[PDB]
């Protein structure tokens, strides 16, 4: 449920060495990779557990008590001085000191290493799912000498994949990024792409957050006589942080502050009995029970009702407000809405018609009128899903929505502009994407925490464009905005 993800560096010998190359030991590149995912799960803050281990080496860290290994850490959600604790390992001083202080390279034996790290899959005491491992190697030859080691590769390998446990080798630059194809299968283990490097890892997880989540499950009675139960889902919440946590000063420790009510006149206490929930205006104070309030919500019950069918195009935006998060109607428990819900969306979409509902949130609420667009089902060859089949949970518009908005005259433009304006926008347009879109200015703080995480000087201080780039603005389009400026006006801004 909260799963496994694993760092590993191969060792024969020369790997922790740089191949005498003048940039880095690709070993070290791997080092910052480890840094990058383990750090990454600071941001993503993933109850997935992470692994740091090496092998193939001089001394050992393990419980399996064999040559050419080191544990680094056991499976973990991260730690600040788990980060720091591993932070020694950059730098040639830290290359070496890391190496020798631990000892660096002698021999190894492959599938031995398999059940090594696998036997870090032993380390699981908890609920995990994903078994995912990464070897760091340029190794062209595991060995030529004992091909019984090779049979051991092709032997235990299939076991460990069959173990559901999956390690691959990303294209880490042995020359050509690798030149080897040949025997390599064993070494390695909703439409997307793949990459050979860490940078993708780096930025991709710079802002990243939770993955496996579906929890509170409501229903929809369609009519009074027929059934569906409805899965509540958050495509997101407009995801925010785990928020500021109380820890006292020098003690550093959680306050375990509590709250109740003393009497605020006499030194006595107060109790929910002793108080109530009031509205007050003018002269009259008026007091009614926290109960009385919470059940004044009551109309029906948490649950949902097909309230009808509407033109989809009937409302585009005259309007908009707090989103649908996405309810997928459950079909395992209640199926046939497999079929029902299926052809529902089929034809209602065909009708450009939608199923209105009155949604009743959890432990009641006052419920509300909200449309449900049938959500279509979009999948390509490898099945990118932009539209998981379902409903758009479409809030209806209401008085408050319209509580105010002005109306007055409008003076209008001319085609003389649009002739240029269009292509002007063609310079201002970009094909956009699903991706690289956020409010990082909050991200920057879990950068600021990446600090104490590594305990270093300045953050990653990475780059997303949520802000426009001038060279392109003044580049592709140019100053034709001048033409527009003096079209109808000498502005002085």
């Amino acid at each position: 449920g909260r799963d496994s993800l694993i760092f590993l560096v191969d060792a024969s010998k020369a790997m922790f060495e740089s191949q005498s190359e003048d940039e880095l030991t690709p070993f070290d590149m791997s080092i910052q990779c480890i840094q990058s995912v383990y750090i990454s799960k600071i941001i993503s803050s993933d109850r997935d557990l992470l692994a740091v281990v090496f092998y193939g080496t001089e001394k050992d860290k393990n419980s399996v008590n064999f040559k050419n290994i080191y544990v680094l850490q056991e499976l973990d959600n991260p730690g600040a001085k788990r980060i720091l604790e591993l932070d020694q390992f950059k730098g040639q001083q830290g290359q070496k000191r890391f190496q020798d202080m631990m000892g660096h390279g002698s021999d190894y034996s492959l599938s031995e290493v398999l059940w090594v790290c696998a036997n870090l899959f032993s380390d699981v005491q908890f609920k995990m799912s994903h078994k995912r491992i990464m070897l760091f190697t340029n190794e062209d030859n595991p060995h030529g000498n004992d091909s019984a080691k090779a049979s051991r590769a092709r032997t235990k390998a299939g076991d460990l994949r069959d173990t559901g446990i999956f390690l691959d080798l990303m294209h880490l630059k042995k020359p050509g990024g690798f030149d080897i194809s040949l025997f390599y299968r064993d070494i390695i283990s909703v439409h997307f792409e793949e990459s050979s490097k860490l940078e993708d890892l780096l930025r991709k997880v710079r802002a990243k957050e939770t993955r496996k989540r579906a929890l509170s499950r409501l229903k929809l009675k369609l009519n009074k006589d027929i059934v569906i139960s409805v899965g509540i889902y958050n495509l997101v919440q407009k995801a925010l942080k785990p928020p500021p946590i109380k820890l006292y000063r020098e003690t550093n420790e959680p306050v375990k502050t509590k709250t109740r009510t003393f009497n605020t006149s006499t030194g006595g206490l107060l109790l929910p009995s002793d108080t109530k929930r009031s509205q007050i205006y003018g002269s009259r104070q008026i007091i009614l029970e926290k109960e009385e309030t919470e059940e004044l919500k009551r109309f029906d019950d948490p649950g949902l009702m097909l309230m009808g069918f509407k033109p989809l195009v009937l409302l585009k935006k005259h309007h908009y407000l707090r989103p649908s998060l996405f309810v997928y109607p459950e079909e395992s428990l209640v199926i046939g809405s497999s079929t029902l819900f299926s052809a529902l969306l089929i034809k209602c979409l065909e009708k450009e018609v939608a199923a209105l509902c009155r949604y009743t949130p959890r432990r009641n609420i006052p419920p509300y009128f909200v449309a449900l667009v049938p959500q279509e089902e979009e999948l390509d060859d490898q099945k990118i899903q932009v539209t998981p089949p379902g409903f758009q949970l479409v809030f209806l518009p209401f008085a408050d929505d319209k509580r105010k908005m002005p109306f007055t005259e409008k003076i209008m433009a001319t085609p003389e502009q649009v002739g240029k304006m269009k292509a002007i926008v063609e310079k201002l347009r970009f094909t956009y994407r699903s991706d690289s879109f956020e409010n990082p200015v909050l991200q920057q703080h879990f950068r600021n925490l990446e600090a104490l995480a590594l305990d270093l000087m300045e953050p990653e201080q990475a780059v997303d464009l949520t802000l426009p780039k001038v060279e392109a603005m003044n580049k592709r389009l140019g100053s034709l905005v001048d033409e527009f400026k003096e079209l109808v006006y000498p502005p002085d801004y």
Partner: protein, 187 residues
Amino acid sequence: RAFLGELKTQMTSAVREPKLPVLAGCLKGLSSLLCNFTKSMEEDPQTSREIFNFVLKAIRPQIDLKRYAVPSAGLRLFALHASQFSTCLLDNYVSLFEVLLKWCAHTNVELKKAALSALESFLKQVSNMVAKNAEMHKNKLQYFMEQFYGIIRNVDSNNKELSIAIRGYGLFAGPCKVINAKDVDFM
């Protein structure tokens, strides 16, 4: 009196039902509380009274005898003169009395005995002011009297199992001092 209050509340607007763990406690140590009261009067009769009256169906059955364990000691330990109460509400109540009697008694369970207990007991308290009252116990005597009395002869033709004990005490409770105001001579 808070706990009294906010459970008095929780019995109301949540599925018309409190949290019975929470009443089991409220009443539970309310045992000792009452033991210390010296004559509750106003709310508390209704407090108890209610709680038992609402213990009477499948509600949120938990260790289902717990549902029944709530009144189990609940009426039982409540022997007070504060527990001399529905002598206010009796002619009404005794209806309810036997309703609960029949209720758990006939409710197939592993604690009947509680029923029997309070049965005898509040039964007694009845009998006690009965012993102290010609006015409110002569007729209303014969009210409660006959209330049970349907059970008195009810035993003759039926199978009540252990409930036999029941009658005798009521079969006493009828004749206590009572041949004075109401002749038990044939009894």
